């Protein structure tokens, strides 16, 4: 169940309300200000890292379950999403539907959106690719 959720469900959830549109209408006060803007933030693919922990001083390193248990840390990985920031603008001629056009500003980077706890012995855990000897090295019980 966890493997299905991490592999497929996470992408599906972010592809439901990915688009956020903020429309700044004409605001007719003078004819030098008659343009209407439209800002759009859209979410693309989601990426997941291996389990990791960030210390107080800001250093991030891979976290293994044995250290997490001893140090009262949460065994979790990071989630990243590709975000596209588009802006269209159109001339708001009075009493007409607008023709929004891309105004040559389409920024397109990975954004951290939180940490996902990882179930042990799962596809995203460090112990799924470990042999019996590897588990013994990592102080894990086969």
């Amino acid at each position: 169940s966890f493997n299905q959720f991490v592999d497929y469900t996470l992408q599906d959830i972010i592809c439901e309300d990915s688009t956020l549109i903020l429309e700044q209408l004409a605001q007719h006060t003078t004819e030098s200000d008659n343009i209407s803007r439209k800002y759009e933030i859209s979410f693309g693919k989601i990426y997941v890292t291996k389990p990791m922990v960030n210390e107080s001083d800001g250093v991030t390193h891979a976290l293994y379950p044995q250290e997490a248990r001893l140090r009262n840390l949460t065994y979790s990985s990071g989630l990243f999403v590709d975000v596209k920031k588009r802006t269209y603008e159109a001339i708001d001629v009075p009493g007409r539907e607008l023709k929004y056009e891309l105004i040559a500003e389409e920024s397109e980077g990975k954004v951290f959106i939180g940490r996902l706890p990882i179930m042990l012995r799962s596809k995203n855990c460090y112990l799924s690719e470990a042999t019996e000897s590897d588990l013994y090295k990592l102080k894990e019980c086969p």
Binding site: L20, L22, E23, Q24, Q27
Partner: peptide, 9 residues
């Protein structure tokens, strides 16, 4: 005058 900011779905 409008709210000068609204969300389209």
């Amino acid at each position: 005058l409008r709210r000068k900011t609204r969300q389209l779905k």
